[PDB]
Amino acid sequence: AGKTSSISDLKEVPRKNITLIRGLGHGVYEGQVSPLQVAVKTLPEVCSEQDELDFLMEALIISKFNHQNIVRCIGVSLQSLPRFILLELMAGGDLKSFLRETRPRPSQPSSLAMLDLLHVARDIACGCQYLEENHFIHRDIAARNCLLTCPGPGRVAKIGDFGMARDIYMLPVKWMPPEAFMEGIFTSKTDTWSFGVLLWEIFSLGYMPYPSKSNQEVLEFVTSGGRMDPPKNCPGPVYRIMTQCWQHQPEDRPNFAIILERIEYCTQDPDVINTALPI
Numbered sequence: 001a002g003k004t005s006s007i008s009d010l011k012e013v014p015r016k017n018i019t020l021i022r023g024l025g026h027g028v029y030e031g032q033v034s035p036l037q038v039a040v041k042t043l044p045e046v047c048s049e050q051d052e053l054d055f056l057m058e059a060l061i062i063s064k065f066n067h068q069n070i071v072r073c074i075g076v077s078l079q080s081l082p083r084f085i086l087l088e089l090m091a092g093g094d095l096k097s098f099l100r101e102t103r104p105r106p107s108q109p110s111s112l113a114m115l116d117l118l119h120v121a122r123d124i125a126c127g128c129q130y131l132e133e134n135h136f137i138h139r140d141i142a143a144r145n146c147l148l149t150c151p152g153p154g155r156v157a158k159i160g161d162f163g164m165a166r167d168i169y170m171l172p173v174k175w176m177p178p179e180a181f182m183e184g185i186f187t188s189k190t191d192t193w194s195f196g197v198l199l200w201e202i203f204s205l206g207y208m209p210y211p212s213k214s215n216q217e218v219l220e221f222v223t224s225g226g227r228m229d230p231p232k233n234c235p236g237p238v239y240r241i242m243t244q245c246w247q248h249q250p251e252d253r254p255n256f257a258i259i260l261e262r263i264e265y266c267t268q269d270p271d272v273i274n275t276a277l278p279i
């Protein structure tokens with residue numbers, strides 16, 4: 001279940017059956033298939049031939065995943081311009097914006113709870129376990145690349161963008177372990193490190209990692225052994241998962257099966273889930 005497919009296996013949706021509504025972001029439109037709501041990621045008609053294969057390849061990989069914590073590919077419109085990849089619409093939006101906007105505030109407190117954060121972490125960890133089990137390295141696990149099905153209770157978090165893994169088939173230094181940015185070595189353990197950073201992102205409620213450091217400051221900091229402090233109010237058991245994710249040797253980092261169990265232990269400890277979030 002690697003790249004045992006080609007363009008011909010993609011579901012071509014006739015262009016006249018696709019409607020573009022409103023723009024959602026960049027780096028994509030809300031759309032309609034005739035009925036059915038979709039997201040449409042577009043390839044600018046103004047682009048190089050390298051861009052075109054990059055677009056095509058991303059569609060192929062996303063079409064081949066089958067996992068509940070990975071955004072679904074509905075289909076494609078590659079034979080008309082601009083080319084489209086049609087993807088599952090995620091009304092909860094990107095994980096970064098969700099955390100920043102649902103931060104408990106005086107007017108709306110207890111908006112989010114620790115357990116809700118644990119569930120997002122589990123969801124994304126579950127998707128990463130599937131990628132690792134299928135020998136796929138994401139290379140860019142980060143809150144900005146995760147999506148939520150809806151805002152309220154019952155939200156599901158899914159990995160929803162694969163641009164960086166597609167590129168090596170600028171660099172997000174603040175999410176990369178030493179062996180990645182020093183050697184260009186990528187393994188399933190480099191995603192583990194990134195998951196630790198994402199974990200820090202979740203429990204900080206959408207803070208930028210290493211908040212006062214530049215990329216080079218981080219690179220020197222991480223190489224010399226420096227690690228982030230716990231997010232405000234972060235339970236110890238959760239921070240320990242982050243710190244085990246940031247072990248210097250990849251071989252000393254947990255795989256995603258182990259991370260999931262550890263998040264679940266966190267999920268069934270009252271001192272963890274009864275910890276109040278900062279407002």
Ligand SMILES: Cc1cc(-n2cc(S(=O)(=O)C3COC3)c3ccc(N[C@@H](C)c4ccc(F)cn4)nc32)n[nH]1
Pocket residue numbers: 024025026027028030039071087088089090091092093094144145146147159160161
């Ligand atoms: C593939 C997909 C995307 C998506 N989507 C749904 C909304 S939204 O629900 O309209 C939100 C507006 O306020 C509520 C949304 C907003 C921004 C966004 N950015 C794009 C660049 C993106 C792509 C991948 C990724 F992981 C993160 N972001 N994508 C949004 N659904 N499905």
